[PDB]
């Protein structure tokens, strides 16, 4: 877990 | 699960609510091939960041892992871009709209070298899209099918995951025919329609990987900036 | 037109009795693989299958009533695909192995002579499981075959009333698979979620046609194993 | 002119 595509699709909204 | 749970009117109405805005470009310039590379590339990465929100509110998305998510979108993205420059060219023929205030025709295409070829493939099919009466309802649900299935026959407990992902696949599935029902269709003809969007869909693939590979191939030779999420993004299909 | 008269029995008759022979490899046992002898067999072979598929092609119903140009459009865009999913159904009953011949069946590490190739592999293999959990029939696998030559090519094109005629063949064939799914039994809903199922692997099929492409062209700029001319003006087509 | 386009005429 260190790819932006990861880091977006937990602090979506 | 709340999406096996759904109805096909819900279905629709998540899909439809869940739509992404569309996005204006950072185009009283003259074009060349570093500008308009420089253009798409921008619009790509702040498309992407609502496709991602987008994507957590596609019924179905949200139950599978983190890893399974990004799988998915790393291998959908571009399929998932372009199905959406195609539906919002329809009423355009002859041109692509990126955004209301980037219109381009088919002959602009050259600026770029070998991108003129994915233009026409593009114009194809939104000619295609134009023809069929291609409904905004079947739209949402196509973009959805792209984004489950052009990931799934590419993965122990993890064959309950994708026995999850083709149940919902089975319900977007029973969303088209209904939707196709609804607007009086026959049975042989909504079989028939059915096939035809979903054969459609190896032309969008087929167009994203041919795009894939120029924008492989211009991230070596090192022209245009490209984000970071979008070096990212790019990298998953080495 | 003579094939849109056709009934869904006669269309699936036509397709079965099309179909190529399952063709030998040249393997030799008596040496080990490397890169480019395992490339020469598998180029080899599908050389031979290229000649049987031309053939085929020209038996199946509608394709026969396109100009030259447009049959060889056709071909040239699908062949590699056509190759492929031949090769998946062939490889159904052999978990974990891909069935290229009756004397050449390989599995995974077997593709990791090639560089490149065990991706391609592992890619083919999840799409022959994938059908066998489907139990695909004989007669939708040649529906599937016919529908890649007729669709994959399409959207690049009065050759529009030819462009009609194609997509009215592949509605015919949506009729058969449809047909065929009652046929043995299935609901109404099971006929149009198993039809789905089918076509949305065309478009994975599709995918590794494309990656195969582009680890072709890589081989052929490296001089790994020699090519026929007609490889390599269908490797040609696909350039860019 | 293409083989391709020979071999499909016989
Ligand atoms: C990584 C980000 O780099 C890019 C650059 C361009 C594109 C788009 C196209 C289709 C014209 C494209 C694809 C490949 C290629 O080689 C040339 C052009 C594009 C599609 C839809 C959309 O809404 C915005 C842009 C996508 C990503
Ligand atoms: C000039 C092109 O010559 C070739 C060489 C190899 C292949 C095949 C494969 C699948 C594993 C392959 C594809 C691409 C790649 O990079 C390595 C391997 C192949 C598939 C089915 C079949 O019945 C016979 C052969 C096809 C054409």
Same mark, same amino acid.
């Given at each position: ?13 | ?76 993205? *571009? ?16 041109? *692509?709209?990126?955004?209301?205030? *980037?219109?381009?025709? %088919? ?22 899209? %134009? ?35 083709? %149940? ?69 299909? %080495?």
């Amino acid at each position: 877990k260190h790819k932006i595509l990861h880091r977006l699709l937990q602090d979506s909204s | 699960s709340l999406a096996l749970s759904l109805t096909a009117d819900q279905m629709v109405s998540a899909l439809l609510d869940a739509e992404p805005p569309i996005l204006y470009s950072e185009y009283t310039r003259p074009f060349s091939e570093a500008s308009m590379m420089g253009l798409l590339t921008n619009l790509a990465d702040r498309e992407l960041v609502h496709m991602i929100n987008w994507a957590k509110r596609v019924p179905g998305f949200v139950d599978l892992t983190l890893h399974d998510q990004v799988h998915l979108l790393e291998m959908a993205w *571009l399929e998932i871009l372009m199905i959406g420059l195609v539906w919002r060219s329809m009423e355009h023929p002859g041109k *692509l709209l990126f955004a209301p205030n *980037l219109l381009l025709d %088919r002959n602009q295409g050259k600026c770029v070298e070998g991108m003129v070829e994915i233009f026409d493939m593009l114009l194809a099919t939104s000619s295609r899209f %134009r023809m069929m009466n291609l409904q905004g309802e079947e739209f949402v649900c196509l973009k959805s099918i792209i984004l489950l299935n052009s990931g799934v026959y590419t993965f122990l407990k993890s064959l309950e995951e994708k026995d999850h992902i083709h %149940r919902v696949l089975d319900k977007i599935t029973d969303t088209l025919i209904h939707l196709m029902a609804k607007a009086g269709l026959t049975l042989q003809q909504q079989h028939q329609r059915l096939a035809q969007l979903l054969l459609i869909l190896s032309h969008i693939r087929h167009m994203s990987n041919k795009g894939m590979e120029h924008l492989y191939s211009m991230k070596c030779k090192n022209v245009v900036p490209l984000s970071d999420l979008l070096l990212e993004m790019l990298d998953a299909h %080495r």
